[PDB]
Design a protein around this ligand. Structure first.
Ligand SMILES: [Zn+2]
Ligand SMILES: [Zn+2]
Ligand SMILES: [Zn+2]
Ligand SMILES: [Zn+2]
Length: 118
């Protein structure tokens, strides 16, 4: 993975935008790295991205089937940034959801902190 943040060219030692140290997050696939805050993640997302092998937008696959086809149907979870095809969920979705959307894994983990709530 890259020892530098794509967005600020900084380190784990220095976020060049904020001035403080901040762990890098790396694409588990192509290695590109960013600071969670440079990636503009909510501090809930900034967390959850570290509990699994995060994939950047270019490398993202459906967590369910594993393929990267049908990008026009690949939903992003607003908490963990994993991808889920609408047709892989149960029930199937015919339409993209409205507003925030939280996947099952985040509902179980983040509970009331998931985006889908108030
Ligand atoms: Zn950065
Ligand atoms: Zn990638
Ligand atoms: Zn799928
Ligand atoms: Zn999620």
């Amino acid at each position: 993975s890259n020892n530098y943040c794509d967005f600020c060219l900084g380190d784990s030692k220095i976020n060049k935008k904020t001035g403080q140290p901040e762990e890098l997050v790396s694409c588990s696939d192509c290695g590109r790295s960013g600071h969670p805050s440079c990636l503009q993640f909510t501090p809930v997302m900034m967390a959850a991205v570290k509990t699994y092998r995060w994939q950047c937008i270019e490398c993202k696959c459906c967590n369910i089937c594993g393929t990267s086809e049908n990008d026009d149907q690949l939903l992003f979870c607003d908490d963990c940034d994993r991808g889920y095809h609408m047709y892989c969920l149960t029930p199937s979705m015919s339409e993209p959801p409205e507003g925030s959307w939280s996947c099952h894994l985040c509902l179980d983990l983040l509970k009331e902190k998931a985006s889908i709530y108030q």
